[PDB]
Design a protein around this ligand. Sequence first.
Ligand SMILES: [Mg+2]
Ligand SMILES: [Mg+2]
Ligand SMILES: [Mg+2]
Ligand SMILES: [Mg+2]
Ligand SMILES: [Mg+2]
Ligand SMILES: [Mg+2]
Ligand SMILES: [Mg+2]
Ligand SMILES: [Mg+2]
Ligand SMILES: [Mg+2]
Ligand SMILES: [Mg+2]
Ligand SMILES: [Mg+2]
Ligand SMILES: [Mg+2]
Ligand SMILES: [Mg+2]
Ligand SMILES: [Mg+2]
Ligand SMILES: [Mg+2]
Ligand SMILES: [Mg+2]
Ligand SMILES: [Mg+2]
Ligand SMILES: [Mg+2]
Ligand SMILES: [Mg+2]
Ligand SMILES: [Mg+2]
Ligand SMILES: [Mg+2]
Ligand SMILES: [Mg+2]
Ligand SMILES: [Mg+2]
Ligand SMILES: [Mg+2]
Ligand SMILES: [Mg+2]
Ligand SMILES: [Mg+2]
Ligand SMILES: [Mg+2]
Ligand SMILES: [Mg+2]
Ligand SMILES: [Mg+2]
Ligand SMILES: [Mg+2]
Ligand SMILES: [Mg+2]
Ligand SMILES: [Mg+2]
Ligand SMILES: [Mg+2]
Ligand SMILES: [Zn+2]
Lengths: 123, 155, 105, 91, 51, 51, 50
Amino acid sequence: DKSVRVFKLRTQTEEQLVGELGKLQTELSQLRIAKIAGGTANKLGRIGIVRKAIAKYLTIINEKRRQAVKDQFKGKSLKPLDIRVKKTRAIRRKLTKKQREAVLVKTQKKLNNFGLRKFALKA
Amino acid sequence: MKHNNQLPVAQLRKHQQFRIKTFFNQAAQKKARLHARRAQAAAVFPRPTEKLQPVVRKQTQRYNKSTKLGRGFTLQELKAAGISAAFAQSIGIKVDHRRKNRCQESLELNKKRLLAYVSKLVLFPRHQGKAKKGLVNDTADTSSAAQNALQTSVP
Amino acid sequence: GRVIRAQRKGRANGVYKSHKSGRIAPAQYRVYDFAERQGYIRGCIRDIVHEPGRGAPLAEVAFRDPYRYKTNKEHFIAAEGQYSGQYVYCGLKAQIAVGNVLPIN
Amino acid sequence: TRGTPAFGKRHQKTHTLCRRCGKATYHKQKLRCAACGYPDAKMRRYDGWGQKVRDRKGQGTGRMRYMKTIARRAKNGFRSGTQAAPKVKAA
Amino acid sequence: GANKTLNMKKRFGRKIKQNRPLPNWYRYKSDTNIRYNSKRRNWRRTKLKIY
Amino acid sequence: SGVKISTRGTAGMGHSAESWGTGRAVARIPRVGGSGTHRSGQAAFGNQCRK
Amino acid sequence: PQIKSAFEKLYNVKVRSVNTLNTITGNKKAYIRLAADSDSLTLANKIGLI
RNA sequence: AGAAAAUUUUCAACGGUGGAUAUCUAGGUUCCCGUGACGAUGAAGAACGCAGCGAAAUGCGAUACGCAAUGCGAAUUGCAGAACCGCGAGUCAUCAGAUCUUUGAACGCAAGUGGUGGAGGUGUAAAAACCUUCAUGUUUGUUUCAGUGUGGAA
RNA sequence: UAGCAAAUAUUCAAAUGAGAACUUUGAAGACCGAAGUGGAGAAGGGUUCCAUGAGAACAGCAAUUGUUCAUGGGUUACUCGAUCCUAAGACAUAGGUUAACUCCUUGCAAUACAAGAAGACAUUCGUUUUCGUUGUCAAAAGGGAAUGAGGUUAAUAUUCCUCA
RNA sequence: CACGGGAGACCGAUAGCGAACAAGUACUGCGAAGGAAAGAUGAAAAGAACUUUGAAAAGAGGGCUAAAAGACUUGAAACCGU
RNA sequence: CCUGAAACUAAGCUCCUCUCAUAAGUUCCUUGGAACAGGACGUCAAAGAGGGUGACAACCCCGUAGUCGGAGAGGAAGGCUG
RNA sequence: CUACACCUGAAACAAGCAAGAUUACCCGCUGAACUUAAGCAUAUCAGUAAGCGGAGGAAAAGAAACUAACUAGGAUAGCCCC
Ligand SMILES: [Mg+2]
Ligand SMILES: [Mg+2]
Ligand SMILES: [Mg+2]
Ligand SMILES: [Mg+2]
Ligand SMILES: [Mg+2]
Ligand SMILES: [Mg+2]
Ligand SMILES: [Mg+2]
Ligand SMILES: [Mg+2]
Ligand SMILES: [Mg+2]
Ligand SMILES: [Mg+2]
Ligand SMILES: [Mg+2]
Ligand SMILES: [Mg+2]
Ligand SMILES: [Mg+2]
Ligand SMILES: [Mg+2]
Ligand SMILES: [Mg+2]
Ligand SMILES: [Mg+2]
Ligand SMILES: [Mg+2]
Ligand SMILES: [Mg+2]
Ligand SMILES: [Mg+2]
Ligand SMILES: [Mg+2]
Ligand SMILES: [Mg+2]
Ligand SMILES: [Mg+2]
Ligand SMILES: [Mg+2]
Ligand SMILES: [Mg+2]
Ligand SMILES: [Mg+2]
Ligand SMILES: [Mg+2]
Ligand SMILES: [Mg+2]
Ligand SMILES: [Mg+2]
Ligand SMILES: [Mg+2]
Ligand SMILES: [Mg+2]
Ligand SMILES: [Mg+2]
Ligand SMILES: [Mg+2]
Ligand SMILES: [Mg+2]
Ligand SMILES: [Zn+2]
């Protein structure tokens, strides 16, 4: 009977975390059956504890799975939308910096041969 | 409608409630303009605030007797100055291509203005290289560091 | 400034909308088969029934389709004296008899 | 009689619950909801027409699952793929 | 009557649950002004909307 | 400073409110038509009236 | 059927029949009859339901 | 002097009804300044759920008044039980990673119905049951095609 | 104070309770009189159903009683109905109209039309074959595959149990 | 208009946004739409121990507290009792 | 008379976000249930804006000021200058 | 006639795009009456409300087929004047 520490969880394997999940769930059901028949406050607390626990376990499992899929897709564009940047529809729909600044030839020429200079007037 | 007083002139006849303008921003606005101007100076530091403006006569018979700041220099004038529009622009000079000189004197004023400008000019090229047109002035001018207003220098 | 009944009869959403639930079929002729323009097609009166909006009886006529195995049913207008199970002849060469269908010429 | 004895005859109900707005605004005979207009597929409300409405149904009226955090992460620059980091610099 | 949608059943269930009285121990909290549940409803005096 | 002006109007103007008309042995002031709220029939926007 | 299977896999019993209720309260009651093989009272006893 | 009471009535004190006045305010109102930043990567809104003891309001979504990360570094507290002194408390804040039921622009079809198609997965002796998937428009392409459209070698 | 006067009626003893014309048992007298004051449904209601308990309020007198308050518990189906079918009807799609929103057509199916279904091998595709113009919603009295008797609960039962 | 900042010769619970509060809520309407009322015990619950009479509510004693201020600050008028 | 995509190569700044820290009486009397009151002696002040602490508290606590200051973390729909 | 090329149309598939929300400000349309003329048609209210379609952080506008005739001025937008 102890609190569950996240890092400790990230230490284990996927198998491990899963087995534990199943165990936890079975625990819960037993416990609710506690509430129903007859039960001690110990069992009541047990409930909330195990619930939160299960959540935590799941959380970890997804962290891992995720970092894995992201790994496979690392390097490619055409990742699954899950992973693609989500900011604003308007954000993604917009032009690039490349395209923002991108300049027609004549322009690059004027920019070279005329441009702007540092000057000072004296008085 | 009673007395001898002058026939009123209706004002609020329509629904003006939607159409009123309020001036409280003015307070802060002035201030904003200040800081803008100042932040321009700082970002422009070696260069002057207002770009070079030629001068002309005003457009009305009553205004002719007076002097007014033009928007740009006449190509004819840049020619007599010996500057290309493009260059003058890289210098901080203001050019206007639709304006035309119908008088010798109007050429004169602006020539005098341009020349005055150039004479008082300092030009920073890519570091320690020197150049030719409108020319380029010595590296020591970098130390001279002039923050100046155009009315002082070219009046 | 009301709308007379006179006017209300042209409304199609209206109250005046025919009661069609009883109608059996339109009563029309055969399709204009080649057979009818150049020859004769014969059919039977399977029955002559009463359409609920009609004064005139309708004749239910079996025809054999020229181009397929299907048997074609059609509803004609009863010509007085036509019997159930009569042979009705339609076309160019069909002869003159009560209830046959020819060109007027 | 248009009155009390008449009221006894009302067991019909012209509206049912609109899937979209969930009141009983749905008109089975007209196939629409008087409030939102569920089949219409864009929200039915006339704003200038009469003024109270948006404050009854409208944006911010019910909880906004997505948008509330948009205010906050608007300022944070819309971070994606970032994790918070310790100021203690543990490696 | 007898015949019901799911939707109906669920809605009715909802309102049935929501119709409980304030639990006697909530009145003992430090930050609450609530003596009673102001939103309780009686089928006879007030009717729901289900159609 | 000023009093609320909004889409609805100057504050206090926020009802659709009528004048019952002379027949009712009541004052002619605007009231709030409606049903079910104690505010119903209550005098509508004007200096005289609460709210 | 989902209930029959799940109940067997979970409780190691043979379910002879399953019947379903939707309470107004919003839950599903399942009345489950075990085959002659098992004894409800027993499953009750192991589960902590006595 | 029907010179007592009861009634009717003036004034005061106390009591009762009632909530004015005075003093307050995590509210309103107006002004100035800063950002505009929703949505098929499924929005705004809707339904039903989620606490050991919970109706509402607020939060949340079967990981359900919350997971993770980060910063604060010991509480929550109405009751009961645990967890934690740093393997770190917390109805704390921050918030950049997750969870995100039935819906809704709402999408296989349909709908006052958890009804019902095709393809794939699963299951079985075969089924049932469960699961995933399929809306329309458009810009490119890819593949397969039609045209007594224009040409047309061997 | 007006008032609590329609719909023939109540009475006795016991018990319970602080308290009984108004609650429960029994004993009498009457009523609805199978066109019911009886037994069950549809619409509508939504927990008003069952049990235990009960201070105030409410049940226009009263109450030991309740349609009220509190707590717990109740709604099991291959054969009942929805779900399927078509109707009066209605709406998409396609095409057209509108500044636009909107609007017009569609079962005798189109103001549309290069829109389908099936089989087999293959068993995916593909291959192959055959026949082919093109949607959906609307009935808890219409159409409509098959169940009955007996027993059981405080509250469900052509559903659970037993038997067929 | 939304989320933020700051401010005011504004308003101060019949005022001020309709909403200082489980307020666009309760409630009404077939519906489009309508839409309120409702803020202040005390510094601290110390929220009235115990005795007595009551079937019970409650009364009389007795007590907390600076004070009952006891469903609550002040506590006006109309009206009512002594 | 001017210019410079490629490649190679040095040093830097701007803006944004989240965190962490800072003066000086709790001395003495009197009235108070409470001292934040009236007195006596003291202090800081580029801080006597404003709040909270049992009462009209600069000095008890949060703050205010030095602070376009200092320290730590992460940022740029992938900032800017040789 | 075939292969094949090109023009035209079609189906399935891959990758992307639109569909709703927002209200203060902005754009394009549509568009009245109350009211004022002490009556009332023109007119006024007024291109105003309501209605519809589109956006953005702003929108729109903008480098003259502009003014002015003077010793001329010179994109657009806002302020002041006129
Ligand atoms: Mg501005
Ligand atoms: Mg029609
Ligand atoms: Mg709300
Ligand atoms: Mg909200
Ligand atoms: Mg019903
Ligand atoms: Mg009723
Ligand atoms: Mg009613
Ligand atoms: Mg009178
Ligand atoms: Mg008094
Ligand atoms: Mg933690
Ligand atoms: Mg498509
Ligand atoms: Mg060809
Ligand atoms: Mg009477
Ligand atoms: Mg009776
Ligand atoms: Mg009966
Ligand atoms: Mg009965
Ligand atoms: Mg039909
Ligand atoms: Mg039709
Ligand atoms: Mg049958
Ligand atoms: Mg059976
Ligand atoms: Mg006493
Ligand atoms: Mg006193
Ligand atoms: Mg008196
Ligand atoms: Mg003392
Ligand atoms: Mg002192
Ligand atoms: Mg102070
Ligand atoms: Mg500081
Ligand atoms: Mg092609
Ligand atoms: Mg739109
Ligand atoms: Mg007017
Ligand atoms: Mg007049
Ligand atoms: Mg005009
Ligand atoms: Mg935007
Ligand atoms: Zn709706």
